[PDB]
């Protein structure tokens, strides 16, 4: 997340110094992950995701829907913290107990990605199967048999195309 933050900041300061001001004819031009103007993923394996996609499936977990996903993208990214145990968000880096909280970006976007990345690349068969069922990712023949990095490629292709 820090590395993603550095790239976002470096791009933003480039367009701020050389480009026009916020009151220019173009308007505000800076990139914001909360705004959905910057995405992630890898083109070699054919999978990419945006903050919009995760907020779509987490509002689904929870016009009207358009407002819901738009306001939720704010809590998806940034220096906001989420306790897994409490189940509620928090603006405080330390919980009342004293437990260190993970930031919401890593806790519910990067966390499923790291779980599936570790599961396939470490050949944990039952972990991969349960994750696919829970995340309703659909696979087909000639793809369900494979294991390893090609299986990793196929999963995120069908999860975050």
């Amino acid at each position: 997340y820090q590395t993603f933050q550095r790239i976002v900041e470096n791009v933003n300061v480039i367009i701020s110094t050389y480009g026009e001001g916020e009151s220019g004819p173009m308007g505000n031009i800076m990139i914001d992950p909360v705004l959905g103007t910057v995405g992630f993923g890898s083109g070699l394996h054919g999978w990419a995701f945006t903050l919009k996609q995760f907020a779509e499936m987490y509002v689904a977990k929870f016009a009207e829907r358009a407002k819901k996903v738009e306001d939720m993208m704010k809590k998806l990214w940034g220096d906001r913290y989420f306790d897994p145990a409490n189940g509620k968000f928090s603006k405080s880096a330390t919980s009342p107990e004293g437990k260190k909280l993970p930031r919401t970006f890593c806790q519910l976007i990067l966390d499923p990605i790291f779980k599936v990345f570790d599961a396939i690349m470490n050949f944990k068969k039952e972990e991969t199967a349960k994750l696919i069922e829970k995340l309703d990712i659909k696979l087909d023949s000639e793809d369900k048999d494979k294991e390893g990095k090609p299986l990793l490629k196929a999963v995120m292709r069908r999860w975050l195309p």
Partner: protein, 196 residues
């Protein structure tokens, strides 16, 4: 020239003791020369401050022991980075002006930070090119009003630990008031008396 310089110090210390009956022994902290120049200009009207080798002072006082007794009380007190200041004005005013004129010392790298500093969330006013220092400390920042804007409060350095070069130069660019200190009175000598 070292012989004449030492002798000139001896006649300097001996005539100042004869001239002034009341003195403060004061310990110089990690205070710059500019801080000392400020002190001397501040006190130029009424007081005169002198510093030097502690072993030099003890020898000169011991030589003057016979002519001026009761000065032996200062002998077991010239220890550490301390010096003299010669005064004729009232103690409480001299002490009060001394504890009031403290320069805002900047953050010097590699030193102990006795004052805990925290940076609030405000627009720094620095252009969007000094962000290299902010990213060096990992401080997430955004550019608002065409200038660097810190998102939230950050604690930078705690008490009793070494400061780094990156932390020091971030404080120098932010121009916030770091740990600052001046000379502090060890003891007081009033015509043969010792107090705090």
């Amino acid at each position: 020239d070292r012989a004449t310089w030492k002798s000139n110090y001896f006649l300097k210390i001996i005539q100042l003791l004869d001239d002034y009956p009341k003195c403060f022994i004061v310990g110089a902290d990690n205070v710059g020369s500019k801080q000392m120049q400020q002190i001397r200009m501040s006190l130029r009207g009424k007081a005169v401050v002198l510093m030097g080798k502690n072993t030099m002072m003890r020898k000169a006082i011991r030589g003057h022991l016979e002519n001026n007794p009761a000065l032996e009380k200062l002998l077991p007190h010239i220890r550490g980075n301390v010096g003299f200041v010669f005064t004729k004005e009232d103690l409480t005013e001299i002490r009060d002006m001394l504890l009031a004129n403290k320069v805002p010392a900047a953050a010097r790298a590699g030193a102990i930070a006795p004052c805990e500093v925290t940076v609030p969330a405000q627009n720094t006013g620095l252009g969007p090119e000094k962000t290299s220092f902010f990213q060096a400390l990992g401080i997430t920042t955004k550019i608002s009003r065409g200038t660097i804007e810190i998102l939230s409060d950050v604690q930078l350095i705690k008490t009793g630990d070494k400061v780094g070069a990156s932390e020091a130069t971030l404080l120098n660019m932010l121009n916030i008031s770091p740990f600052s200190f001046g000379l502090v009175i060890q003891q007081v000598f009033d015509n043969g008396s010792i107090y705090n």
